[PDB]
Amino acid sequence: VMNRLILAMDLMNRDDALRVTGEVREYIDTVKIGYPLVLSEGMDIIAEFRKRFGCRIIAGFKVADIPETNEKICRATFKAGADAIIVHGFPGADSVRACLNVAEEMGREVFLLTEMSHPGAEMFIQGAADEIARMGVDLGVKNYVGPSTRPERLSRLREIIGQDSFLISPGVGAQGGDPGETLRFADAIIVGRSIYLADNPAAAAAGIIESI
Amino acid sequence: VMNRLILAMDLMNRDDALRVTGEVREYIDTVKIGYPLVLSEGMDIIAEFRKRFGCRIIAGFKVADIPETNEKICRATFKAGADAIIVHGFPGADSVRACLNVAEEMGREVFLLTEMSHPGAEMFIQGAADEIARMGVDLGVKNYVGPSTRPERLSRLREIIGQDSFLISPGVGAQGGDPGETLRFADAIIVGRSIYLADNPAAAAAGIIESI
Numbered sequence A, B: 001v002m003n004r005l006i007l008a009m010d011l012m013n014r015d016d017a018l019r020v021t022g023e024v025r026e027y028i029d030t031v032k033i034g035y036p037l038v039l040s041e042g043m044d045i046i047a048e049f050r051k052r053f054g055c056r057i058i059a060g061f062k063v064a065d066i067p068e069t070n071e072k073i074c075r076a077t078f079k080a081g082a083d084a085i086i087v088h089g090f091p092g093a094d095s096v097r098a099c100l101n102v103a104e105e106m107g108r109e110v111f112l113l114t115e116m117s118h119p120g121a122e123m124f125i126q127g128a129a130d131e132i133a134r135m136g137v138d139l140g141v142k143n144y145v146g147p148s149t150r151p152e153r154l155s156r157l158r159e160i161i162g163q164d165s166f167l168i169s170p171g172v173g174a175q176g177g178d179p180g181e182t183l184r185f186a187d188a189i190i191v192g193r194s195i196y197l198a199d200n201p202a203a204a205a206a207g208i209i210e211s212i
Ligand SMILES: O=c1cnn([C@@H]2O[C@H](COP(=O)(O)O)[C@@H](O)[C@H]2O)c(=O)[nH]1
Pocket: A008, A010, A034, A060, A113, A115, A116, A117, A118, A145, A146, A147, A170, A171, A172, A173, A174, A175, A190, A191, A192, A193, A194
């Protein structure tokens, strides 16, 4: 992705979301849109962003349901225009395979979330993360999400998935993660608040890029 | 699209196609892949390009069949990962609507080809082109293709579709069209041979961009 930087656009109002995204567009080419924006403004916001900014859109939906429901969620998400969707691996292989089947049908991609970046991720997710990553490899997953806040875990995850897999990483900035250290292991970093809550989002994005 | 320039990648061998596309990637972000490459190397080449270069892919398939067959062609094309497909308008509204229905189902886009750029287009297509463009407007089409070789026709087509519609234009270079004149009316130009048959494709792309 452009400058190895993905904007997590979690503002809830369409006007502010469009303003900030347009201001930092020259520094990115990929935007992660999640439920904070979609549940407030509707799924049509995905196609609007894709058209207006010509950026790739990752739907950050943390899909975590049974196979049947996961299939419906992925179908609606790709119908809305998303290029990829993030799915949790903790609910198991069948739930991930359901997402992979819809992505195959629709010519889209699935990103498998292994370990999360927040403190609570240490409680249960961390202990299952290496196995979730290996499950991904077994299922043919080529895109993964891992934590900026724990570079030693990001290193181990990179070890499991290999150098050819694409790995993106949130938790940079607000959560404590460092851009440069994270990029020693991840292909791209996801940044939300450090950019969208800044007084000057473009200057904030430019600063991150210059730091790396 | 980047630099308002779309590469028409009509080389037939995968190695040469990948070489040239990689060499000019910094000047573009959108590649038109058609049957010369797909029929020689397979539909999987679309996903390969999309992944390797991170570019948007327009399938230049000139869809021109009955509704039922058009639906199947569009479904296979979007399943293969194409972001958009070019469809002929001369076979009529039902044939175009079939493509629009699949694009809606799959969160993709249809480009309507109005008038073609080659000499033979004057025989039958030109006389129907204004009506084909109006049909597009009536059907809700927002993306169009018009001829670089006839800027007065491109102007009339732009008049019919409005300023908000996206218009791309082939026939630049080899066929005689001029980049700058074409861009007075079209949003982007499509260039094939002037770039891919050049001794230095990157220098050729750079020259076109500098000329505009
Ligand atoms: O382990 C994970 C997975 N996903 N995200 C998501 O990535 C973004 C990070 O935003 P931030 O830069 O504002 O912390 C948000 O959309 C958040 O839901 C995390 O923060 N951590």
